[PDB]
């Protein structure tokens, strides 16, 4: 599954600042739009 990352690992995030679904910059774990960090792993 998506536990322990694995191949079908998570990626669909939801930024609280943009209130939209995003794919985070993994090296930073931030938003690709506002670069905040306030995101939810869906
Ligand atoms: Zn954002």
Curated annotation (Swiss-Prot):
Species assigned in the record: Homo sapiens
Tissue and organ expression note: Highly expressed in liver and testis.
Ranges in a coiled coil: none
Impact reported for residue 16 to A: Impaired interaction with BAG6
Binding site for Zn(2+): 15, 18, 31, 34
Residues carrying Phosphoserine: 7
Protein name (record): E3 ubiquitin-protein ligase RNF126
Post-translational modification: Ubiquitinated. May undergo autoubiquitination.
Start and end residues, zinc fingers (C4-type): 15-34
Domain topic, free-text comment: The C4-type zinc finger is required for interaction with BAG6.
N-acetylalanine modification, residue list: 4
Tree of life domain: Eukaryota
Assembly and interaction partners: Interacts with CCDC50, EGFR, FLT3 and SCAMP3. Interacts with BAG6 (via ubiquitin-like domain); required for BAG6-dependent ubiquitination of proteins mislocalized to the cytosol. Interacts with CDKN1A. Interacts with AICDA.
Cellular location(s): Cytoplasm; Nucleus
Role of this protein: E3 ubiquitin-protein ligase that mediates ubiquitination oF target proteins. Depending on the associated E2 ligase, mediates 'Lys-27'-, 'Lys-29'-, 'Lys-48'- and/or 'Lys-63'-linked polyubiquitination of substrates. Part of a BAG6-dependent quality control process ensuring that proteins of the secretory pathway that are mislocalized to the cytosol are degraded by the proteasome. Probably acts by providing the ubiquitin ligase activity associated with the BAG6 complex and be responsible for ubiquitination of the hydrophobic mislocalized proteins and their targeting to the proteasome.
